[PDB]
Amino acid sequence: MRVRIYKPARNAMQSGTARTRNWVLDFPPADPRAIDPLMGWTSSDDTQSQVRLRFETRKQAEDYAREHGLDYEVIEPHTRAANIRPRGYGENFASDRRAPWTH
Amino acid sequence: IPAPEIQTVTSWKVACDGDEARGLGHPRVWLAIPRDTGWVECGYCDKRFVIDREHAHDD
Amino acid sequence: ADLRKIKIDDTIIEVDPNMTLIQACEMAGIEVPRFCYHERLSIAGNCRMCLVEVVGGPPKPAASCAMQVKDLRPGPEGAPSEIRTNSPMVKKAREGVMEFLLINHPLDCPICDQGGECDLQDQAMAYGVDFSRYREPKRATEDLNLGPLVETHMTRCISCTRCVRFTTEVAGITQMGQTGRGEDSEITSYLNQTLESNMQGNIIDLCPVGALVSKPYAFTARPWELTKTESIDVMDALGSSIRIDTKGREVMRILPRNHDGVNEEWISD
Amino acid sequence: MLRRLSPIQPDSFEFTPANLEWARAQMTKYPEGRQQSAIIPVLWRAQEQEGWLSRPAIEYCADLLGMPYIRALEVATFYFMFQLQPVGSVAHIQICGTTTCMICGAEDLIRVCKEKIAPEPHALSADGRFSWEEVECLGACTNAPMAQIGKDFYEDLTVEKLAALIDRFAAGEVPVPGPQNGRFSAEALGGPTALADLKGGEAHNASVARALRLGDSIKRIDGTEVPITTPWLATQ
Amino acid sequence: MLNDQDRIFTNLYGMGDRSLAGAKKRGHWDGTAAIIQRGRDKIIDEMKASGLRGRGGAGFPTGMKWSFMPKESDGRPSYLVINADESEPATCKDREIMRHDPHTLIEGALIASFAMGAHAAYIYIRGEFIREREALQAAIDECYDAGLLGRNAAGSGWDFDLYLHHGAGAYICGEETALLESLEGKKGMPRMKPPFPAGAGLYGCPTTVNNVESIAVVPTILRRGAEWFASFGRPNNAGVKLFGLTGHVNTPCVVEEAMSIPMRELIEKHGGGIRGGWKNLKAVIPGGASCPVLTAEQCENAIMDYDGMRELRSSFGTACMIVMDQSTDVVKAIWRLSKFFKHESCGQCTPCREGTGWMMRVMERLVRGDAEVEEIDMLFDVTKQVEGHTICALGDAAAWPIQGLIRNFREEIEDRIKAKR
Amino acid sequence: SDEALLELAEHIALRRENDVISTQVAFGELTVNATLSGVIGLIEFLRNDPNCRFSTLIDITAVDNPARPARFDVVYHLLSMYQNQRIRVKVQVREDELV
Amino acid sequence: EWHGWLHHTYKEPPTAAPLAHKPWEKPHEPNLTGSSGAYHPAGSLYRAQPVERRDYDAWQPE
Amino acid sequence: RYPNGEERCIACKLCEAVCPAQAITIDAEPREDGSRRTTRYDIDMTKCIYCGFCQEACPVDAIVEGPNFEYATETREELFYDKQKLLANGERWEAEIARNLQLDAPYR
Ligand SMILES: Cc1cc2nc3c(=O)[nH]c(=O)nc-3n(C[C@H](O)[C@H](O)[C@H](O)COP(=O)(O)O)c2cc1C
Ligand code: SF4
Ligand code: SF4
Ligand code: SF4
Ligand code: SF4
Ligand code: SF4
Ligand code: FES
Ligand code: FES
Ligand SMILES: [Ca+2]
Ligand code: NA
Ligand SMILES: [Zn+2]
C-alpha cells in the first residue's frame, strides 16, 4: 500500500523538541472506521494501521520502504530557523521602537 | 442544574476537598469568590460557596 | 558572518554572535528548560527557568534567553567561552524556580485540559524535586471573560506574559495587560471585554499552562488519544501548515504547525 | 491586595481649564513623541482634582497622552498612591507601619484610627468624611511614628496627639503639620547637634512653611492655586 | 569628628536662610563656570581621585560610572537621571537635601550633566514627598530666573535643562532600570542587564543614574578638592556621609559625619545614646531594611563604612540605622520587613513574585512560634533560592534580612517554638 | 565483578581475535559482539575453555531493528555454574541471511 | 448491609455496628441475569428500541 | 458519588490511560452547567483483568473495584457495562465500599 515517511512536527501546545528528532514510516488508515451499534465503539478491519516504524534518518526510512516494495511519499520537514535578534533583549528598549515594550 | 450543596461563607477565598477524612475526597483547591456575583463552584465536587456580604470580612 | 566558538558543557560549537545562549544551546542539541521565552516573541526573562552557569563570570546564574553570545567575556588567550547547563549550580537553580512555580499552582491536573501536554508538568517531572515543602494557603484568582474561543482558569497562570506579548506584537491589539503588583498582579483584558482579533486563538498554544484554553475543545479529549495528521489548510489561499487531531472518525481540533515560509507557526481563527 | 477599579464609577471626567492647561505644560518636559512620560503626574492631578482616580479619568488621561487604556490602567494599579475608590471626603489618614515606626508605636496609632475613623482600612467613616490605611515607610523615620494626611506629614505622633489631630480635622480645621514634639525638621530633639548656629533663620522647615502659606493640605486642586510656568521652553 | 567647616550640607536642617541668596552666602553656585571650563576629562578624573562611591546603596565608584558614558554623540542625546526615590524603609537622608539644601543638588546636577555631555537631567522623586517636590521645584525656578539653568547655564556655555518628575508610590522604582521604565510612562519593572544604561537607558539613549546625595556632593568636591574629600574616612572608604539614626536612641536625627566613624561614637555623640544606656542595646540594622541585622556585641567595634559592615557580614547600605533595645521583638522587626518586601516586589519574575510571599508567611509563624524547628533551616534554604536568581536586586534585598536574623538570633527563634509548644 | 568481567573479556578477545568484534561491560553484564561466521566457534570456546566454562545455554532470542542495514540481532545467553558467571553474545544478521 | 459480615470483612454484625448510608443510595438487587430486568447495553437487540448512533448531522433538502 | 450526591468522576481519563487491557472507553463534554463530566463511561468486563490499576490512578476515588463477585451472566453483552450500570452499582454498594476505603486508607 501507500506509506507516509515524514518527520513529526513539534506539538504546538508545548515547547519541547525531543519528539522531533526521528523519522517515522506510517501506514495511514486505509478504509473508513465504523460505529459499533451495541456500545458505540469505533470498529475497524484495518490492522495494518497499527504499524508505525521509527528511523533516525530519511534515508533509512526510504531504504526500508524500497527493500519491502512499499509505495511511499516523503513529506519534507519544515525546520524553524533561529530568530536571531541583532540587539537581543536590548531591542525591547530601542529608541526607534514603534511602541513601548509591555514586559 | 441546581447545586448539590451550598455553603455560606464570610471570606472571599475558600478551600474545598470534598469534606472527606484523611484522603477520601478530591485534591484540595482554593477558590475565589468574585465580588460581582458573590459565589464560586468547586470544579471537582460542584459545591457552591456563596458570600455573606454583610459579614464578609476582607483579609 | 564572523562566527564565534563557544563551549556548551562539553560541546564546542560555532555560532552567530548575535544568538542568545538559549538559541546556541538548541543549535548544539542541548535541552534548556523555559517558560517565558518563545522564538517568535520578544525576550522577557521573567520565568527564570533558563538559568545557566557562565564559567568564570560572577556567581549569579545567567538567563540564557537574554544573554547574547557576544556578551560573554572571551576565554583566556582567546579560548572559546564556556557555559554549563549541567553543573550543580544549574541543578539547584532549576529546582528552586520549579518549587516557586508550584507553591501557588492549583491541584488541577485531572480537570485541566493542558494535562498530558503541559510544559509545567513535564519540566516539573524532569527538573524539579518530587515533594513539596509549602504549607500555606494557595493563591486563588478570578477568571476572565475573553469570549467564546478562550476559556480562562487564571489560578493556573504562571505570569509568563506570552499572551500579552503575542496579542500586542503579533496580533497588533492592545487589550491585554498585567495589572497590579507582586503576587497579586493579574493578567487581564481591559474592562473584562472579549478579545477582538481573528488571530486570538494562537494564545491557546502559546500559554504554557491551562490558564488559556480552547472553549470549543474543552473536556473532549486528552492529548495521548489523538491521531495526528500533518495537512494543509484551505479556509484561505495562504495554505497554512496545520495538524489535524482525530479520535476515531471525527476531527477533534486543528493546530498550527511550523512553516517558516508560509504561516510561521500561527493560524487564523 | 487586588488592585481593581471601584464598581461604582462617575459617568465622565474632565480637567478644569486650568488643570488642562497645567497638564499640557507637563507634556513639554519630555522629547517629541514621549508625552506618555507625563502619565503619572497627569493621573496624579486627576486624583487631586477629584479626590480619587476614576475610570473616566484614566481613559481621559490616556486619550490626552495617546496611550492605550490598558497601558494607563496598568499605571493606575501598579502605583499604590492612586486611590481607585473614594476615600474620606475630608481627609484620608495614611499611617506608616514599617519597622522603625512599628517599634516606636505605629500599631498603637492604628488602634486609634480603628476607634475613631473605621474598623477597617479603606473604609469610609459613617459620615463618609474620614478613612485610613497603613502604608510603608514614608521616609521620615527619624520622626517616627508618623502619618501622612493630605499633602503633609504629621510627625512624632502619639495616641493622644493623633487622637487630638483627628478631632481638629473633624471640626473643619487643618492642624499645623511637621514634628508635633517641637522639633524643627530632623535634628536631634533638644537642639541641633550640628550646624547649631543657623537656628532662628527660618520660623518653620520647608515642608511646614509651605503648608501654612498655601493652606492646600486637604484641598481639591482646581489648578488656579499655583501659576503655571515653563521656564525650560526658553532654553532652545 | 566632623566640624561645621567640613560639613558639605551646611543647611541640612533648613534653619538658615533658604532663598537662593542665602545659598550663595553659603558658597553655593560659586564659580560654577570655572569648574565647567576645566573640561569633561578633568572633572571625571577629579571625581575618580576623590574616591566618591555611590550613595544610593551599592557604593560603586562614581567617577568610574561617569566614564562609561560616550564621549561623542552618535545622534542620541545623553541623559542624567537623579534618583530621589528614597523608599528604603530606614532611609530619610535624601529628604533633607531636596527641601532644605536643594541648591547643592541643582549645581551638582549641572556639573555632573556637563561631565557626561548631557543637556537634560531628570530628577525622579517619590510621590509621597509632595512638599519636598514643591520646595525643590521652587528652587529650580529660582535658578532658571538667575540664569543658573537654561540657555547658557551659569555662564558656562552649556545648555542645561533640569526637570522634576515624581512617582506614585513604588519602592521598586528606586531600582535604576525600573526608574527609567517609570520615567518613560510605564509601570516600573526592572530591566535585565545588558543593555546597560550607559548604552541604552532613558528612551534607549545613554543614561547615568545617580543618587541625590552622590550628585549634591559633587560641586563641593570640585571646589574644595578631591584630596580634601579623600582625607576623611579610611582608605577606599573616602568622604563625609549623611547618617540616619532611627529607632530606640534618645534623640533620633539625620546628621553629617565622616566615613568610618565607630558606630558607638556616632550613636552617643549625635543619637544621645541608646534608650536606657548602651547595655540596653539589642540589635542594629545598620544601613536600611535590606541590611543584615547586627547583634549588640557585633556593634561594639563596628566601623561605619563599606568595609566595616562587610567585615561583620552585613552591608553599609544607605547608612541609616534602626536601633532596637532589649524591649523589642526582633523576630517581629525582621518579619515586618519581609511584609514590606512582599508588598513591594514588582511581581515580574518568579523567585521574588512567589518567594517573598512565602518568606513573609513563614516569618509570621516564627514570630508566633507556630512552627517546627526544622522550618528555620528550610526558610534559610528558601532565601538562597531567591538570592541571585532574580532580575533585580530586590530579590536579594528580601533574602538578606532573613538570613541575618537566622545567623544572629537563631536561639531567639527556637525559644519561641519551645515557649509555645 | 566489574574488574573480573573486563578481565574475562580481554581473555576472550585475545584468544578469539577474529571471532570477536568488540566487548562491553554495562550494568554489570558482559556482552560480546561476534561475527556471524565465527559465532559457533566462539560459543564452543566459551563452553570448553577453563577460565570461561559456559556449559549452560540459558536461551537464544532475536531483536528486530528495522532502521539498521542488518535488521536482526541474535542474542545468546550463557551461564557458567562452575565459574559462577554469565555472558551475552550478540551477532548481527541480515534479512534472509542464514545463521 | 450484611455482605461484609458474612464474608468476614468486618468483625461485628450490622445489628451491633450498622453501616452508614447516604440518602442517595439505592436498595440492593440480586443478580437479574435470566430475567427481563437484566441490564443490557443501550444498543442491544433485547432493548426493542435500540439507541441509534451517529456522529454527524446530515443536510436535509428543502 | 460524593456525600453531596454529585458524581465523583470528572472525566480526567487517567483510568482509561493506565488500563492494561484497554477495557475503559470515555467520552466527555462540558455539562449544561459547565461541569467537567463524562457522557460515556464503558468498561468491557470481558477485556478487564481486574488488576485495580484504574482505582489506583483515579484521583478522586470515582472508579473502584467493589466487594461483589457473584454477577455471572447468561449473555455476553450483559458484561458490557455502561455508565448508568456502573453508577447503579455504586449507589447499591456504597455503604460497603465506603467502609472498605476507610479500612485500607492507612495503607494507600
Ligand atoms: C529595590 C531597589 C531599590 C533602590 N532604591 C534606591 C533609592 O531609593 N535611591 C537610590 O539612590 N538608589 C536606590 N537603589 C540603587 C539603584 O539601583 C542604583 O544603584 C543607584 O541609584 C545608583 O546611584 P549611585 O551609584 O550614585 O548611588 C535601589 C536599588 C534596588 C535594587
Ligand atoms: S497547567 Fe499543567 S501543572 Fe497546572 S493543573 Fe494544568 S496540567 Fe497540571
Ligand atoms: S495566561 Fe498563560 S500565556 Fe498569559 S501570562 Fe499567564 S501563563 Fe503566560
Ligand atoms: S526581583 Fe522582584 S522586584 Fe525585582 S524584577 Fe523580580 S519580581 Fe520585580
Ligand atoms: S481493573 Fe480492569 S478496568 Fe481497571 S485498570 Fe485493570 S483491566 Fe483496566
Ligand atoms: S473514573 Fe477517575 S480516573 Fe477515570 S476518568 Fe473518572 S475521575 Fe478520571
Ligand atoms: S525562558 Fe529565560 S527567564 Fe524565562
Ligand atoms: S519606617 Fe515609618 S517613616 Fe520610615
Ligand atoms: Ca453544577
Ligand atoms: Na495552554
Ligand atoms: Zn470540591
Residue numbers in the entry:
A (entry chain Q): 1 to 103
B (entry chain R): 3 to 61
C (entry chain G): 2 to 270
D (entry chain E): 1 to 236
E (entry chain F): 1 to 421
F (entry chain C): 6 to 104
G (entry chain q): 63 to 124
H (entry chain I): 56 to 163
Authors' description from the paper:
Complex I transfers two electrons from NADH to ubiquinone, feeding electrons to the electron transport chain for O2 reduction, and captures the free energy released to transfer four protons across an energy-transducing membrane, generating the proton motive force that powers ATP synthesis. The core subunits of human complex I share higher sequence similarity to complex I from P. denitrificans (Pd-CI) than to other bacterial models such as Escherichia coli or Thermus thermophilus.
During processing, relatively poor map quality was observed for the distal membrane subdomain, and classes that lacked density for it were again identified suggesting the subdomain was lost prior to reconstitution. Specifically, the ND3 TMH1-2, ND1 TMH5-6 and NDUFS2 β1-β2 loops at the domain interface and ubiquinone-binding channel are well ordered in their closed-state conformations, ND3-Cys47 is buried, NDUFS7-Arg77 points away from NDUFS2 adjacent to a loop element, ND1-TMH4 is bent, and ND6-TMH3 is fully α-helical. We propose Pd-CI is stabilised in the closed state by the PIMT, which binds on top of the ND3-TMH1-2 and NDUFS2 N-terminal loops. Density in the central polar region of the channel has been assigned to a partially inserted ubiquinone-10 molecule with its headgroup within 4 Å of ND1-Arg38, Trp41, Met244, Lys295 and NDUFS7-Arg77.
